[PDB]
Design a protein around this ligand. Structure first.
Ligand SMILES: Nc1ncnc2c1ncn2[C@@H]1O[C@H](COP(=O)(O)OP(=O)(O)O)[C@@H](O)[C@H]1O
Ligand SMILES: Nc1ncnc2c1ncn2[C@@H]1O[C@H](COP(=O)(O)OP(=O)(O)O)[C@@H](O)[C@H]1O
Ligand SMILES: Nc1ncnc2c1ncn2[C@@H]1O[C@H](COP(=O)(O)OP(=O)(O)O)[C@@H](O)[C@H]1O
Ligand SMILES: Nc1ncnc2c1ncn2[C@@H]1O[C@H](COP(=O)(O)OP(=O)(O)O)[C@@H](O)[C@H]1O
Ligand SMILES: Nc1ncnc2c1ncn2[C@@H]1O[C@H](COP(=O)(O)OP(=O)(O)O)[C@@H](O)[C@H]1O
Ligand SMILES: CN(CC(=O)O)C(=N)N
Ligand SMILES: CN(CC(=O)O)C(=N)N
Ligand SMILES: CN(CC(=O)O)C(=N)N
Ligand SMILES: CN(CC(=O)O)C(=N)N
Ligand SMILES: CN(CC(=O)O)C(=N)N
Ligand SMILES: [Mg+2]
Ligand SMILES: [Mg+2]
Ligand SMILES: [Mg+2]
Ligand SMILES: [Mg+2]
Ligand SMILES: [Mg+2]
Lengths: 368, 368, 368, 368, 368
């Protein structure tokens, strides 16, 4: 009957009195009550958006957004809660007013070569979603298989240096997968509670895979945390070559994908849409590992790092710590700046860090 | 259940990598995704609109639109795809901004007499659709029979020189139909793939017919490719008389049709609505055949023809080629210009063509 | 408004006064009125079922059903019209009461070797539809591509003698396709009016292909007239080996298809569901070509052939005639009998025909 | 099914080629097609509005509107057709633009006494509808009974000179009803085709009645052609007393009706809503009979009458003619002018008419 | 539009080619296709039912069902898949035909005392669900809080020896929770993949708690894996006292719950409804730990255990192994047998096990 009463929204309000994530900070009873009825056309709802944040109050060793998007419409349907979170996460970028600009030019990134005694590794990463298909948090098996087929068919057209092969996770022996993971190429099974709570580990390892070139300098993860994750890696400090290869490969992949009538998720307000609001905009993360004996001498590291808008993850894996200090240092903000700008910022920050080692003298300049 | 997922629009996107029609040129994944859910009140959909273009990439010896309209609402519902196609097809006429004006006056078409040694035939054609009834691509049997009844009842009222008789295709012996076709009067069965793919050959020959006057100088095809096709023909170069008869007969037919409460499809933005976007506006085609020994001497013909906005089809039938060169030359653009203007343009172009007989001198002037 | 009146069903009733197909014979105003509102869950309707029959009254040189099915549900939704047609087409088999049994055993088909001087070719064909996907008359582009992907992935698992390769029609040069067609391997473009009117030529050649083994003795047409057409052919009279290979290959293909969670359309009442009601049940056609000088001496062929329940097509296919008499003789009925029974019947009929070479004496026995 | 086609609106368009009513004049195929889907909340439709006009092309001896309203919403829902009709019927009043003002003051109508030798009868009539109840063309039995109950209960409260009694038509002997009709008090059974075609004779004589005061100078017809018709009569030429009594009685009746929570249909754009668009606005008709020997001498009567905006009906009954000339002369326009203005206009026109007795002189002044 | 096509069910079919759980064994494409549209009134669907089984193919050291129920209606809506699974899991009990009988009598369980040198612990467990509230896999925050409130209010009425207190998990320090877990009283956080994949760890630790008596011999877990889990423990081999206390406490709890108008989920076909089909029927598990030096001598243990219908989990925790062999031995089947019968079976099995200590002789009797 229509006379039956629903549970009032405040009855469903999560208990976030001990949470320490941006979703908990920016969620209020008014917002929850306002948004608890809405839903994206594919059925995504607010509770599904904030489940990962609700279940995970902590997760060292970095601050977490606590939200995910089930599809493109989410960021528009639940903008009343995503917008403040995005603004806080990206040092003040305002999606409501500002616009995002993307440029991928390896010409305007001159220099960008690091000392081989302090870097010994350079990687550039980005993510891409296929329009019309639900994101990993909400995708069904059919949608995941469709994403895999589209990506594999597109990548089959890559020729020349970028030519490579696709390896299905379900067809790889555990030893091979472990060897690939230990080499920083493949992705590990999603056991971290943040991924599991978001629902981005359903049906594992179905429809997940890795497409890599023969030199393994150009890789593409299929269906791990986004529809596609494009990676360009090199064991050294030559960020210039890595970024040039990344740019050309990404352009070719986009062209091949569009050839078949598929287009990436994108809007000028937010840039490239991805699951985690922390990856919006360019979704780009350019970083380098650090030599063990050197940066270990730092004492006021976090202040300097927040000074330069850089983030320091441990060795391979965000969930891992740093032992025998070798830190993966990358840019912190991915929205509001162009890819070239982000790479230049990373290069400048790393040059500062290696210059700030000061193994002969003492003194931290910070230099806000 | 509502949790089941539909095929993403890009999955249905046609493969037009080898097509050479305006629909293929102006169709993009964004447009297809935007329009793949809409539908006219009678159920016409985008796929039905573009089926003929998808199936037919070629079709010599002229460029083809590759689209058809199922009803009046189509041009409004799918305007996002029809408008660029119409603009390209009609040398820049912009339906969004401009307006179309129609005038049928035989007084302001002074002159217009061709040399009898180079024309020997003059025809004028137009199309008309009855409002409220689906177009041939989408019409059911009941709608087709209704169109036939309305047209026949209206035409029964014609008196005087225009007085004529209606002949039902289903009641005509094959020999009589073949004789009429060979005389350029009747229409042949629609075997060309463009007509069949559009669905404009369903239930043949049911409800199709030809109404012609005793002299056979005035004819009306019922349910061939439009609801009505009004034709005025004469074996000679006297375009003036042909056009005068065409104008008066068309006015009388329109009056008789409106007498019973039926009105033609029409809107000032597009003019007279017809199935093929190439026939919008006036839908008028005025043309003449050409004497065999004469125009055969031409070498740079296509450049001159595109110069004058004229189209050259072979002998009887667009699908046929030209042998022993005798070309059917007509106007190319039917929207944005009035009927009088189009006829005057055809007369000027034909006078230019005959003036360039070059049986005693050489040189092509083009004269853009 | 709800006060508006629909066209009465009799207004839409087709004009079949001159038709000569089973649909025209068994269609009555009462049946049409009863069924003109129903529709299968995918939207198939009666008019779409009978369009091919309505448009085509003739089509030599064989009697035609005049109907097609858009999906599995059709045969159940429109049973009131399909059942009499099926019963008449399959010499009295009653789908309402009887049941169909299928057995594919090459052991119980002993003998089956024809004289090499009168056969010189032996082929066995069947069709199969993937459950859950619309049939070629109604399938959209996405469904056709899904069928192609499922079939190709399944067939990739065939090993040993059956090992083969898939060739996409869109990627084959016209010369190669013509050579394959002339060799009786590949299928030609569907230009015959029966196929076009049924809508089984939309989006050609998208998603159509041929998968064949290295010896080309085992072929599979993908998306030509059914979802799959499995063919086993040999240039000779050894029907035994051909049928054995056909049986084992079909079993392997079915196993591979089921491995991935796809099941063939099938119900014990009708057997294997296919587009044309003439292919229901087993859908099997076993046949042989005939030597030119020999059977040409016959005069009362049609009576004998109808006596033996055999069909006589042209050497080039159903749509071609027989010149320099070389007739493709096959079984006529495919529903109500098992595959082994049909093959044995074909063998017995061919042995009877060759026994009646009438080179020594004369006289036709008929032998009903 | 949704694929079935409705009859196109032009198929339902009435055949008005021989009609002579305002509805026929102002009805066009475009208007009919536009309005043939709409309907008032109570279910009234355009065909029901125009049925009376369609069935009746003639009806001497006056020009007829040819339309009726089923409820209050009609004039708003079908304004596209009622507005031109109202404008033509009320000599230019434009309901879209201008507003209507009502005043009932017997003080500002000084004079207004006619010669007893040329009038011998004075009547004033008006109509009123109860809001929330369907009009007589569309009212069901329950609604008609509700109207009767509301009106009778209200009128029971009248006191003093206006005190009277209610007589139910179903409880009155035929002789009494005939006597009342012959005295110009009661209304006759609705046998005229205009009333019957409009559906305003259904369930006769159920729920119809007459409430009159003891002197029979104040009367109220219940459910004859409107919900209420208030009438004030006097056998003489004293229009002043008749009109003041009419005003006070109408005010008292309105007060009593509003006492119980019922309000009259009214909007400033149109005034008081009634069934026939010819009665909109005030709905007031003030008139007088004429002595037999006197006005019979007129020859150019119609021109003069149209000059003064007066209408001449025969003796008792609009449907009746004038024998032994005694004409009922009243105002022609009821909308756009106030009641006092209309009464003054009638008085001036009657004074003009009697002044033109022409028993001793000659001249048709007309005096536009 | 309604012309868009859904993904065929076989496209969503899980890839279970390597799974080893009952759901994978008893899931077929036909069943999946049949059930993929249905849904319980609260929105539970088949994919949600089988997600835990799909994600987890293994999970030593016991065979897993691989399914869960979202609410009471699930077992009825998806019976076509639950029934075979239940039958296989409960050694042939047929829910379709048979009925379940429950009796909780401590009188008819005479004896039941184990040797203190081989048991040193005795526990009895059961589960209960509140009717009208979604099960832990599907319950929202409001429903979980409602379950907690109902259970706590009911348990507040327990008096006498059963008198106890409720401890909210969110209000207990980590040290206290760890101490309780190490003592085998409290439940640990659900980190095992089977619980997480089923969605039974959402919003942890909100609304989860433990209500225990002062002696801690009677405990009730609130919202861990069922709505309520009632447990009775004793550090010894006196199963008689444990079971009688369990019976009386359960009866009192049920009475108190029903006092407020709440009733347990129950139907005679299945008994007491719970999330995991392995806990249906009584949901009872009676077990004992085993002394370290003793049962370690066994070699053919699994055959004997399957002989006696007993299951051997490791030490505290099903997910944990057995080191220094001390096995938790309990009954294996909970549906089709009464609680008294199950406890007697457990007692007989444990007596057999201890009798087969073989510390003096050798030989395994099995004794099927
Ligand atoms: N600079 C680098 N050099 C080598 N490997 C890297 C680098 N940065 C990241 N990786 C590899 O990427 C994998 C996942 O790292 P993660 O923190 O998830 O980066 P992302 O943000 O791109 O997911 C790790 O296994 C790690 O080895
Ligand atoms: N100038 C002409 N003289 C004689 N016949 C003509 C002429 N133009 C067209 N026709 C006749 O019209 C028929 C169809 O021509 P088509 O190219 O379809 O013209 P339309 O554009 O009006 O369809 C042909 O059979 C042809 O004989
Ligand atoms: N027994 C046979 N031997 C050789 N070729 C054959 C045989 N049967 C069919 N074909 C070839 O297959 C092609 C299509 O045959 P068709 O008449 O469509 O058979 P079906 O009815 O099974 O489709 C033709 O080109 C024909 O040459
Ligand atoms: N001036 C008048 N004097 C007497 N009776 C009248 C007068 N005007 C109208 N009536 C009476 O009203 C009755 C109906 O007349 P009708 O033309 O319908 O007027 P209305 O416009 O009020 O309907 C007739 O029977 C007639 O006798
Ligand atoms: N016989 C027993 N004696 C002592 N503790 C037990 C016994 N059985 C179970 N437990 C305790 O119950 C907790 C959970 O046990 P579990 O294996 O989940 O039982 P269930 O299969 O009923 O969930 C463990 O921490 C364990 O210490
Ligand atoms: C660890 N996280 C959370 C974040 O991005 O803040 C991922 N989105 N992977
Ligand atoms: C041949 N065509 C295509 C076109 O007009 O371009 C017809 N519409 N008939
Ligand atoms: C030629 N036909 C018609 C028939 O089978 O009768 C095909 N279905 N191919
Ligand atoms: C006679 N008529 C028609 C009209 O008013 O024009 C009535 N409405 N009574
Ligand atoms: C470990 N399991 C699976 C099972 O019961 O089989 C739980 N339901 N807890
Ligand atoms: Mg990462
Ligand atoms: Mg043409
Ligand atoms: Mg064939
Ligand atoms: Mg009247
Ligand atoms: Mg447990």
């Amino acid at each position: 009957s229509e006379r039956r009463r629903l549970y009032p929204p405040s009855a469903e309000y999560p208990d976030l009195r001990k949470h320490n994530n941006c979703m908990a900070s920016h969620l209020t009873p008014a917002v929850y009550a306002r948004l608890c009825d809405k839903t994206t056309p594919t059925g995504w709802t607010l509770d599904q958006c904030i489940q990962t944040g609700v279940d995970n109050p902590g997760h060292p060793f970095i601050k977490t957004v606590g939200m995910v998007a089930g599809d493109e419409e989410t960021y528009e349907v639940f903008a009343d809660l995503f917008d403040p979170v995005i603004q806080e996460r990206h040092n003040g970028y305002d999606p409501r007013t500002m616009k995002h600009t993307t440029d991928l030019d390896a010409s305007k990134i001159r220099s960008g070569y690091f000392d081989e005694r302090y870097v010994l590794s350079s990687r550039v990463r980005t993510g891409r979603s296929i329009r019309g298909l639900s994101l990993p948090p909400a995708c069904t098996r059919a949608e995941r298989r469709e994403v895999e087929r589209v990506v594999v068919d597109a990548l089959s057209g890559l020729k020349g240096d970028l030519a490579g092969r696709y390896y299905r996770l379900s067809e790889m022996t555990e030893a091979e997968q472990q060897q690939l993971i230990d080499d920083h190429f493949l992705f590990d099974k999603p056991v971290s509670p943040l991924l599991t709570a978001a629902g981005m580990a359903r049906d594992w390892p179905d429809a997940r895979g890795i497409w890599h070139n023969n030199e393994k300098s150009f890789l593409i993860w299929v269906n791990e945390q986004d529809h596609t994750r494009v990676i360009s890696m090199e064991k050294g400090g030559n960020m210039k070559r890595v970024f040039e290869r990344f740019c050309r490969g990404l352009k070719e992949v986009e062209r091949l994908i569009q050839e078949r009538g598929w287009e990436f998720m994108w809007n000028e307000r937010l840039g490239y849409i991805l699951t985690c609001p922390s990856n919006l905009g360019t979704g780009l993360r350019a970083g380098v590992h650090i030599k063990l004996p050197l940066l270990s001498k730092d004492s006021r590291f976090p202040k300097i790092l927040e000074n330069l808008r850089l983030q320091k993850r441990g060795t391979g894996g965000v969930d891992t710590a740093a032992t025998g200090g070798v830190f993966d240092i990358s840019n912190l903000d991915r929205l509001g700046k162009s890819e070239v700008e982000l790479v230049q910022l990373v290069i400048d920050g790393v040059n500062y860090l290696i210059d700030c080692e000061r193994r002969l003298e003492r003194g931290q300049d910070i230099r806000i």
